[PDB]
Design an enzyme around this catalytic site. Sequence first.
Site, PDB file in Angstrom:
ATOM      1  N   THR A  69      -6.934 -18.834  51.452  1.00 53.32           N
ATOM      2  CA  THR A  69      -7.398 -17.822  52.432  1.00 53.32           C
ATOM      3  C   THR A  69      -8.906 -17.563  52.373  1.00 53.32           C
ATOM      4  O   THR A  69      -9.579 -17.555  53.408  1.00 53.32           O
ATOM      5  CB  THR A  69      -6.709 -16.437  52.285  1.00 53.32           C
ATOM      6  OG1 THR A  69      -5.327 -16.548  52.647  1.00 53.32           O
ATOM      7  CG2 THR A  69      -7.356 -15.416  53.190  1.00 53.32           C
ATOM      8  N   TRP A 111       0.789 -20.559  46.175  1.00 54.91           N
ATOM      9  CA  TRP A 111       0.497 -20.720  47.599  1.00 54.91           C
ATOM     10  C   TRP A 111       0.473 -22.202  47.947  1.00 54.91           C
ATOM     11  O   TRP A 111       1.046 -22.631  48.941  1.00 54.91           O
ATOM     12  CB  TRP A 111      -0.866 -20.129  47.967  1.00 54.91           C
ATOM     13  CG  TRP A 111      -0.978 -18.721  48.475  1.00 54.91           C
ATOM     14  CD1 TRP A 111      -1.406 -18.352  49.716  1.00 54.91           C
ATOM     15  CD2 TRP A 111      -0.747 -17.500  47.756  1.00 54.91           C
ATOM     16  NE1 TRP A 111      -1.438 -16.984  49.826  1.00 54.91           N
ATOM     17  CE2 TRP A 111      -1.027 -16.436  48.641  1.00 54.91           C
ATOM     18  CE3 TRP A 111      -0.306 -17.201  46.462  1.00 54.91           C
ATOM     19  CZ2 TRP A 111      -0.893 -15.099  48.271  1.00 54.91           C
ATOM     20  CZ3 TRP A 111      -0.170 -15.871  46.099  1.00 54.91           C
ATOM     21  CH2 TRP A 111      -0.462 -14.839  46.998  1.00 54.91           C
ATOM     22  N   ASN A 157       4.626 -18.900  48.683  1.00 53.76           N
ATOM     23  CA  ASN A 157       4.125 -17.794  49.500  1.00 53.76           C
ATOM     24  C   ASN A 157       4.234 -18.020  50.991  1.00 53.76           C
ATOM     25  O   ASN A 157       3.617 -18.934  51.528  1.00 53.76           O
ATOM     26  CB  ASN A 157       2.657 -17.511  49.170  1.00 53.76           C
ATOM     27  CG  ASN A 157       2.123 -16.264  49.872  1.00 53.76           C
ATOM     28  OD1 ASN A 157       2.509 -15.140  49.553  1.00 53.76           O
ATOM     29  ND2 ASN A 157       1.251 -16.467  50.854  1.00 53.76           N
ATOM     30  N   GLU A 158       5.011 -17.169  51.652  1.00 55.32           N
ATOM     31  CA  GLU A 158       5.173 -17.226  53.099  1.00 55.32           C
ATOM     32  C   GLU A 158       5.555 -18.604  53.640  1.00 55.32           C
ATOM     33  O   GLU A 158       5.159 -18.982  54.740  1.00 55.32           O
ATOM     34  CB  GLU A 158       3.900 -16.705  53.754  1.00 55.32           C
ATOM     35  CG  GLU A 158       3.789 -15.201  53.540  1.00 55.32           C
ATOM     36  CD  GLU A 158       2.516 -14.592  54.076  1.00 55.32           C
ATOM     37  OE1 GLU A 158       1.827 -15.254  54.874  1.00 55.32           O
ATOM     38  OE2 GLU A 158       2.216 -13.440  53.699  1.00 55.32           O
ATOM     39  N   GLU A 234       3.919  -7.913  49.480  1.00 58.93           N
ATOM     40  CA  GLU A 234       2.556  -8.062  49.977  1.00 58.93           C
ATOM     41  C   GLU A 234       2.331  -7.191  51.217  1.00 58.93           C
ATOM     42  O   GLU A 234       3.097  -7.256  52.172  1.00 58.93           O
ATOM     43  CB  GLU A 234       2.184  -9.510  50.291  1.00 58.93           C
ATOM     44  CG  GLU A 234       0.682  -9.590  50.591  1.00 58.93           C
ATOM     45  CD  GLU A 234       0.142 -10.986  50.774  1.00 58.93           C
ATOM     46  OE1 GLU A 234       0.428 -11.876  49.946  1.00 58.93           O
ATOM     47  OE2 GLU A 234      -0.634 -11.169  51.726  1.00 58.93           O
ATOM     48  N   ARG A 356      -0.986  -5.347  60.167  1.00 57.12           N
ATOM     49  CA  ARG A 356       0.325  -5.953  60.339  1.00 57.12           C
ATOM     50  C   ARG A 356       1.491  -5.084  59.854  1.00 57.12           C
ATOM     51  O   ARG A 356       1.657  -4.882  58.654  1.00 57.12           O
ATOM     52  CB  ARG A 356       0.368  -7.301  59.608  1.00 57.12           C
ATOM     53  CG  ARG A 356       1.310  -8.329  60.201  1.00 57.12           C
ATOM     54  CD  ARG A 356       1.281  -9.654  59.420  1.00 57.12           C
ATOM     55  NE  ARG A 356      -0.032 -10.294  59.396  1.00 57.12           N
ATOM     56  CZ  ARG A 356      -0.873 -10.244  58.367  1.00 57.12           C
ATOM     57  NH1 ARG A 356      -0.547  -9.579  57.267  1.00 57.12           N
ATOM     58  NH2 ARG A 356      -2.045 -10.861  58.434  1.00 57.12           N
TER      59      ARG A 356
HETATM   60  O1  DZX Z   1      -3.355 -10.733  55.805  1.00 55.96           O
HETATM   61  C1  DZX Z   1      -3.591 -12.024  55.311  1.00 55.96           C
HETATM   62  C2  DZX Z   1      -2.726 -12.189  54.033  1.00 55.96           C
HETATM   63  C3  DZX Z   1      -3.380 -13.072  52.926  1.00 55.96           C
HETATM   64  O2  DZX Z   1      -4.113 -14.056  53.589  1.00 55.96           O
HETATM   65  C4  DZX Z   1      -2.421 -13.773  51.929  1.00 55.96           C
HETATM   66  O3  DZX Z   1      -3.093 -14.931  51.516  1.00 55.96           O
HETATM   67  C5  DZX Z   1      -1.049 -14.120  52.572  1.00 55.96           C
HETATM   68  C6  DZX Z   1      -1.242 -15.032  53.794  1.00 55.96           C
HETATM   69  C7  DZX Z   1      -1.343 -14.100  55.004  1.00 55.96           C
HETATM   70  C8  DZX Z   1      -1.303 -12.692  54.391  1.00 55.96           C
HETATM   71  N1  DZX Z   1      -0.454 -12.928  53.187  1.00 55.96           N
END
Ligand code: DZX
Length: 641
Positions: A69, A111, A157-158, A234, A356
């Site tokens: 990220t 991740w 992750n996700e 998260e 979000r």
């Molecule tokens: O809001 C963005 C967050 C961070 O970027 C974390 O890495 C993960 C991926 C999207 C969300 N959860």
Amino acid sequence: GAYVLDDSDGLGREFDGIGAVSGGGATSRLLVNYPEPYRSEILDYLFKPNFGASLHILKVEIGGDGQTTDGTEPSHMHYELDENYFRGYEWWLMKEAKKRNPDIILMGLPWSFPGWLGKGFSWPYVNLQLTAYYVVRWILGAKHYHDLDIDYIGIWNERPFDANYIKELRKMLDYQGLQRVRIIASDNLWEPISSSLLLDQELWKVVDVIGAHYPGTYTVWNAKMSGKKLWSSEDFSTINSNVGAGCWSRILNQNYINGNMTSTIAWNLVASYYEELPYGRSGLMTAQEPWSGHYVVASPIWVSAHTTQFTQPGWYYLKTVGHLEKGGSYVALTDGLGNLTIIIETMSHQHSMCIRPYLPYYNVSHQLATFTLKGSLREIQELQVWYTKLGQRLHFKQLDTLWLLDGSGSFTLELEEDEIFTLTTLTTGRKGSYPPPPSSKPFPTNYKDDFNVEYPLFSEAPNFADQTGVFEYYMNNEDREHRFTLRQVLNQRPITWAADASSTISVIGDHHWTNMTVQCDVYIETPRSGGVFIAGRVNKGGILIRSATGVFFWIFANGSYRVTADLGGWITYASGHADVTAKRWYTLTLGIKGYFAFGMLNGTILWKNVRVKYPGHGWAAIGTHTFEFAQFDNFRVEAAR
Ligand SMILES: OC[C@@H]1[C@H](O)[C@H](O)[C@@H]2CC[C@H]1N2
Ligand SMILES: *[C@@H]1O[C@H](CO)[C@@H](O[C@@H]2O[C@H](CO)[C@@H](O)[C@H](O)[C@H]2NC(C)=O)[C@H](O)[C@H]1NC(C)=O
Ligand SMILES: *[C@@H]1O[C@H](CO)[C@@H](O[C@@H]2O[C@H](CO)[C@@H](O)[C@H](O)[C@H]2NC(C)=O)[C@H](O)[C@H]1NC(C)=O
Ligand SMILES: *[C@@H]1O[C@H](CO)[C@@H](O[C@@H]2O[C@H](CO)[C@@H](O)[C@H](O)[C@H]2NC(C)=O)[C@H](O)[C@H]1NC(C)=O
Ligand SMILES: *[C@@H]1O[C@H](CO)[C@@H](O)[C@H](O)[C@H]1NC(C)=O
Ligand SMILES: [Ca+2]
């Protein structure tokens, strides 16, 4: 009107703690080279009990060498047969957190994964045992090298989970004597993990916690039915201005009230990454200038305190929690020892929007709230009072004690909008304080690194933020002039989480920079096909690194050079031939001023007065054409902001 707090009919769910995420990705990048005492002060604001955010939980990324990220984080296994438990900064962070609070809860989550684990595919489920083996080595290493006990392990992750993987991960943990480590799944949405647990008893046995991301304070019926602990594993991810603190305040309460979630974890712990990188300044506080020592103890730190200083993992929520008539909410917790904590929030819509999700409007207005203590809570005669007002001050101020002598387990408060009150029997509360740190200053307009450090404290040189690939200190005893360099160490694309670039790149400096001269010694290790670059005005990174534009000065081992406007190399400013080969040191210089750039090879002009887009601004950078070994030395940048 009158809100009854009582434990006579029994308790609600056990509270599991509040915490934050370091990682996803490289969010703590710029904190490791903070000078003392400031680095230590920052850590205290985060982890020291009865001081600052006083976090119960620390979640870290298990680095897999991919972009996650705001940068890449190094893995403990770059290659097959490679093991190294001293790369990156998560080991350090966990230890620093553990020093301040021995009881802090540690979590790890991948991740991305090194590419070799995919065995020719970009998929971590090709060889279940291999991926599990990889993850467990991390947990073992944590213990053996750092004396760290990891409390929870996640999946991916996700990203999708594999039921057979989760089962194999459990079996592999148990085989290695890690029966105590618990599994959280699937760090994505409530489904499909929640229904899967109801249909598959063996899966149900191995998953200890269902962790959902950004749930909007709500869960779903299948999760409730499961009887598992439910966590917002998260959340937040909002700029730590007043709106973010509001967001944080509101969800901390309502995640439990609306969704039965007994833990919430903020992304991210501290904003120690360039602000112009994706989601900048979305940590509980801000520490993005190690060169100056400047940090900001932002509002969210104190919002956290309102809960964390007055609760601990293992306390219980009361059954009596809810919304206030005119908006806002209250929770209450006990420790089964006679203590009671009450946390009240009246965050208005306009000052508490999370990114979000975004909530439809709701009203908060001035109101009175009467609280009555029934059952075993009747015997409380005194409560400490802590108060925060968001909007322009007051943060975590201790007000006058309330007395409950009337014999009537009751008291009333006048609530306004955007406030927090904490009422607790505990006397340990403290608004921790250090003197202000140095003022903000731009990244230095002249900057040099010769990477000559023999026993570095960390595996990479300060301020270089890898956005694709991994760059590391490297010692070559067989060269003298270049004994100590920086090296790109990935030799294949990771199992990516993000869309990593096709070229490796690390960025550095001041995104505001517009005119600059960048110079570096470079060394291409791959004959014929290898290539490297230096760059300026690099305008995008992180998740968006593929999108980077700027001025890129490439040289290749086939005796050519190119100047491009983009990392992808699709737009040409210039190109030609150069006396350049693999395994030789060259000094590259790139000068950008206004509409024009020039490049030097070994102090001699290679191209000049080449027209480049202007205006434009961004970081300096180094990197390699693909995922390939290359070295860099004696880096310097002089720039004007
Ligand atoms: O809001 C963005 C967050 C961070 O970027 C974390 O890495 C993960 C991926 C999207 C969300 N959860
Ligand atoms: C999940 O939390 C809900 C609250 O959101 C709990 O349900 C409440 O139960 C009381 C009586 O037990 C009802 O009067 C409330 O109306 C319910 N709340 C809502 C919003 O409907 C529920 O106990 C929790 N689920 C568990 C613990 O499995
Ligand atoms: C509230 O919590 C405090 C802190 O946990 C309790 O105080 C502890 O009590 C245990 C035994 O009950 C002692 O061994 C510790 O030494 C105490 N620690 C401190 C810091 O005081 C307290 O008993 C609880 N109840 C009340 C009414 O305060
Ligand atoms: C970066 O370089 C450009 C190009 O020289 C500078 O732009 C000039 O600035 C001077 C005085 O500020 C003007 O008289 C010129 O007309 C400008 N030329 C162009 C093409 O814009 C710019 O000011 C420099 N910026 C920094 C921050 O150093
Ligand atoms: C909020 O509530 C108050 C009183 O109930 C009312 O006067 C006010 O207009 C409401 N605001 C909105 C936007 O509905
Ligand atoms: Ca050197």
